[PDB]
From a paper:
In ebolaviruses, the fusion loop is encoded by N-terminal residues of the GP2 subunit and is composed of a hydrophobic internal fusion peptide flanked by an extended fusion loop stem, made up of GP2 strand β19–β20, and a disulfide-bonded base. In the prefusion state of GP, which is the target conformation of neutralizing and protective antibodies, the fusion loop is found wrapped around the outer equatorial surface of the glycoprotein, forming a close interface with the [name] core. Engagement with the host-cell endosomal receptor Niemann-Pick C1-C (NPC1-C) and possible additional triggers are thought to lead to conformational rearrangement of the GP subunits, release of the fusion loop, insertion of the fusion peptide into the host-cell endosomal membrane, followed by formation of helical repeat hairpins that catalyze virus–host cell membrane fusion.
To uncover the structural basis for the breadth of CA45-mediated ebolavirus neutralization, we determined the crystal structure of the fragment of antigen binding (Fab) of antibody CA45 bound to a mucin-domain deleted ectodomain of EBOV GP. The CA45 Fab-EBOV GPΔMuc complex was set up in a panel of sitting drop vapor diffusion crystallization screens, yielding crystals that in one condition diffracted X-rays to 3.72 Å. One CA45 Fab-GP protomer complex was present in each asymmetric unit, yielding three CA45 Fabs per GP trimer. The structure shows that CA45 targets the stem of the GP fusion loop and mediates extensive interactions with both its [name] and GP2 subunits. Apical residues of the HCDR3 loop inserted into the previously defined “DFF” inhibitor-binding pocket, located beneath the β19–β20 fusion loop stem, displacing native [name] residues D192, F193, and F194, which were disordered in the structure (c and below). D the mode of binding of CA45 HCDR3 apical residues I100 and F100a was highly similar to that of native DFF lid [name] residues F193 and F194 within the cavity, especially when comparing placement of the aromatic side chains of F194 of [name] and F100a of CA45. Modeling of the A101V escape mutation at this position predicts a clash would form with CA45 F100a, consistent with disruption of antibody binding and viral escape.
Residue numbers in the entry:
A (entry chain H): 2 to 8, 11 to 35, 35a, 36 to 42, 45 to 52, 52a, 53 to 83, 83a, ...
B (entry chain B): 32 to 187, 211 to 262, 268 to 280
C (entry chain L): 1 to 200, 202 to 212
D (entry chain A): 502 to 614
Write the structure that this text describes.
């Protein structure tokens, strides 16, 4: 049913991103597309689940390759194009079209389910660990960062601010939550997980 | 007699012996398709206590089977292994060619005993028991099936499931006592207020050693 | 190849108003279109398919009609959770073309920014680079003016401003102005103030001594 | 004639399963010894409720059940398959059962030339 994605990438390198399809067989009458959105949406390519008919975008003639795998039920995408403008967020999603029990009226309908999300930063900068109280998470690279309060049990009132890139290149944000003044001192702790560097902070 | 549905460019319409026009064109038998749809899409009750209320035994009626080429993915299927209290079976063995329903998510494997005042078990509401591309009117012993109906149309580390074992007492009667068999020595009671995902969370904590058979009862909040 | 443009780029409306988004096409298209919604910090969702049908799990207030070259999406009785970017989509042609996502903004009565100040931490000052945080929460509109007063000195160039999007439930902004400097220029001063100039009585200033 | 969804609920999305009669995979894939098992012969698919089709479909099967049930009680075939081929021939008979001409609605000929 739902889709999850896996994925910094050095220049001229192949950004290997896989789109694993959970809760459903990958081999079917559906299509599978790749979508991205540069900061300030765009269709990348389409691969037919059945018969392996891969179709791409004119602007990406010799710069995109989409492969499928039925064993692991995943879909990989390699980007050898060192365009340096592809530093955006990517997504994968299916579109069942209008398939009346094999009879394919049109194989391009609304994309029903999408992926969880995957951020890519095409840049030449070594990945540096984060640094977390007030809790402010600053001096980290690359983005993004997931901050959870009380292991996710605290969601109301919490409002994390966007990440601003310092002059030193390292990003910096702030995460502050409003709690009753009577509860201050009676516990609380911010839980952070930086998957790019694989460094948990509590 | 039997109505067919010809899909016309947006949706379907019924046209049969009385209704025919030159606009429709059937150039090959591939356009004809018999579709088997599950009863889940109609909003019927899916738990074991209510599903068994729609089945009953009856003698003197010859069973009949019909083919359906394509079917819908079923979430809750049923597999009965009922035997009479003396020890004899109640349902007939699945004949050759008939196999369990292909796509199921929660296969409710009921294993109990009942009076079985009849030869075959039919559907009280008239729905069919869906099997592997075969829609029958009875229940076959130890054979996974799904309730549903059939139509006829004219057209222009992998994915798996999980079975659920049960222990019934007095199957097919107004007085029936169902039991969830989490383990051979640890079983819990059931009711219509239990969802398939809830039972999946039971083993998640039931942990399936001289306590013997233990009957349990849940009182959630 | 086939081009489609969604207009207007910017759009602001109050809760309860009816929004109308248009998406023209360069080439003719059949009754096959789609509309998508993408809330901030969330993956996109399917809102409409085939230009007329609602997706699974969509409230019955996203009305979409049109055919041929000009299509239209209508949101009756806009709500606060509808704050998102809405894009266009093509069908029955290649390549699959999108449109310029129309960013939706919500209108709310002027709110008072709850100003807070957080002096640096003992761990944040041990490395040698202390940082002060001045939080503004639940104010509308986003127009604000936050300045730092470090012992009467107007701090400039060393602050990092960051405004968030309108909250999905509160429909309001939140500003986090952070002043980052070295420990050398930090210990040389005692009081760290932060004044806020907002439309909604007088500039509020929050200070903090050595403590 | 149209169809009205009289069922209590309707699942607009129809996750279906069917067989690919032309899943060739030229080489050695169609051999029963080397082919799939009884479980991997299907190919799934999804059908959105476009223009009330899926809800209008779940009612057609609930209504076909009556006429289909009487048809099964009549025949003695333990397994009935000719139902599809029955309507296939009746369609030809309805249009070519007797004589024909371009004179009325019984026959379908349009010789404009
Ligand atoms: C095609 O689709 C239609 C539409 O769904 C199907 O119609 C259904 O046909 C069956 C056939 O038997 C009927 O069974 C009888 O149902 C009544 C209950 O009906 C009331 O409740 C309905 C459901 O509400 C509950 O259940 C659902 C799902 O489980 C839940 O979601 C709900 O929350 C509830 O818990 C409800 O739909 C009915 O609606 C009424 O109003 C609408 C219009 O608003 C009408 O269309 C309906 O027809 C109806 O008037 C209604 O509120 C049971 O009480 C019956 O039980 C006994 O009596 C039956 C009739 O005699 C008998 O057949 C049973 O065997 C049973 O016998 C009992 O009584 C006997 C004495 O009379 C005793 O001798 C015996 O021992 C026993 O005690 C029965 O189960 C459905 O009601 C009917 N539903 C509808 C909506 O029409 C149709 O079946 C489908 N076709 C096929 C082939 O599947
Ligand atoms: C759908 O049917 C209408 C009926 O007039 C027709 O005009 C239209 O072209 C059809 N759509 C197709 C054939 O794609
Ligand atoms: C049930 O839970 C136990 C945990 O003790 C586990 O060993 C077993 O595999 C589980 N079985 C199922 C069917 O979930």
């Amino acid at each position: 049913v739902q889709l999850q994605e896996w994925g910094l990438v050095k220049p001229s390198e192949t950004l290997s991103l896989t789109c694993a399809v959970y809760g459903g067989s990958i081999s079917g009458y559906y299509h599978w597309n790749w979508i991205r959105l540069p900061p300030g949406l765009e269709w990348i390519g389409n691969i037919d689940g059945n018969s392996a008919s891969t179709n791409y975008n004119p602007s990406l003639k010799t710069r995109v390759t989409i492969s499928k795998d039925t064993s692991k039920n995943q879909i990989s995408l390699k980007v050898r194009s060192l365009t340096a403008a592809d530093t955006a967020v990517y997504y994968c999603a299916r579109d069942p079209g209008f398939t009346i029990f094999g009879v394919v009226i049109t194989s391009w309908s609304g994309l029903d389910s999408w992926g969880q999300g995957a951020v890519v930063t095409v840049s030449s900068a070594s990945t540096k660990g984060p640094s977390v109280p007030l809790c402010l998470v600053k001096d980290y690279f690359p983005e993004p960062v997931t901050v959870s309060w009380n292991s996710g049990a605290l969601t109301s009132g919490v409002h994390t601010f966007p990440a601003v890139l310092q002059s030193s290149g390292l990003y910096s944000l702030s995460s502050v939550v409003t709690v009753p003044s009577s509860s201050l001192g009676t516990t609380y702790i911010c839980n952070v997980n930086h998957k790019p560097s694989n460094t948990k902070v509590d | 007699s039997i109505p067919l549905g010809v899909i016309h460019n947006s949706t379907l319409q019924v046209s049969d012996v009385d209704k025919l026009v030159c606009r429709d064109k059937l150039s090959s038998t591939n356009q004809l398709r018999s579709v088997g749809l599950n009863l889940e899409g109609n909003g019927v009750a899916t738990d074991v206590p209510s599903a068994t209320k729609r089945w009953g035994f009856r003698s003197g009626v010859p069973p009949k089977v019909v083919n359906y080429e394509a079917g819908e993915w079923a979430e809750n299927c049923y597999n009965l292994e009922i035997k009479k209290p003396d020890g004899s079976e109640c349902l007939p063995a699945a004949p050759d060619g008939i196999r369990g329903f292909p796509r199921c998510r929660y296969v409710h494997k009921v294993s109990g005993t009942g009076p079985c005042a009849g030869d075959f078990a039919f559907h009280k509401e008239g729905a069919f028991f869906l099997y592997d591309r075969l829609a029958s009117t009875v229940i076959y012993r130890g054979t996974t099936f799904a309730e549903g109906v059939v139509a006829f149309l004219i057209l222009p580390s992998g994915y798996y499931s999980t079975t659920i074992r049960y222990q019934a007492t007095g199957f097919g009667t107004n007085e029936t006592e169902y039991l969830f068999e989490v383990d051979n020595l640890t079983y819990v009671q059931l009711e219509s207020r239990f969802t398939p995902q809830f039972l999946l969370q039971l083993n998640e904590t039931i942990y399936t050693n001289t306590t013997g058979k233990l009957i349990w009862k849940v009182n959630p909040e | 190849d086939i081009q489609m443009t969604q207009s207007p780029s910017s759009l602001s409306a109050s809760v309860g108003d009816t929004v109308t988004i248009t998406c023209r096409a360069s080439q003719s298209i059949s009754n096959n279109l789609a509309w998508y919604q993408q809330r901030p910090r969330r993956a996109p969702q399917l809102l409409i398919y085939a230009a007329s049908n609602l997706a699974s799990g969509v409230p019955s207030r996203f009305s979409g009609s049109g055919s041929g070259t000009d299509f239209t999406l209508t949101i009756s009785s806009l709500q606060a959770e509808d704050f998102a970017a809405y894009y266009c989509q093509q069908h029955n042609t290649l390549p699959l073309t999108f449109g310029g996502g129309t960013k939706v903004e919500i209108k709310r009565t002027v709110a008072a920014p709850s100003v807070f100040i957080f002096p640096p931490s003992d761990e944040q000052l041990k490395s040698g680079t202390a940082s002060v945080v001045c939080l503004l929460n639940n104010f509308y509109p986003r127009e604000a003016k936050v300045q730092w007063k470090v012992d009467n000195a107007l701090q400039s160039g060393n602050s990092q401003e960051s405004v968030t999007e309108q909250d999905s439930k509160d429909s309001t902004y939140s500003l986090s102005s952070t002043l980052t400097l070295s420990k050398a220029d930090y210990e040389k001063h005692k009081v760290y103030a932060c004044e806020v100039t907002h439309q909604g009585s007088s500039p509020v200033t929050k200070s903090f001594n050595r403590g | 004639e149209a169809i009205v969804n009289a069922q209590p609920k309707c699942n607009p999305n129809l996750h279906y399963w069917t067989t690919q009669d032309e899943g060739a995979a030229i080489g050695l894939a169609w051999i029963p010894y080397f082919g799939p098992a009884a479980e991997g012969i299907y190919t799934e698919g999804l059908m959105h409720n476009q223009d009330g089709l899926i809800c209008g479909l779940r009612q057609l099967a609930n209504e076909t059940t009556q006429a289909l049930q009487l048809f099964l009680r009549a025949t003695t075939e333990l397994r009935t398959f000719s139902i599809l081929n029955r309507k296939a021939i009746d369609f030809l008979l309805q249009r070519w059962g007797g004589t024909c001409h371009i004179l009325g609605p019984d026959c379908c000929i349009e010789p404009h030339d």
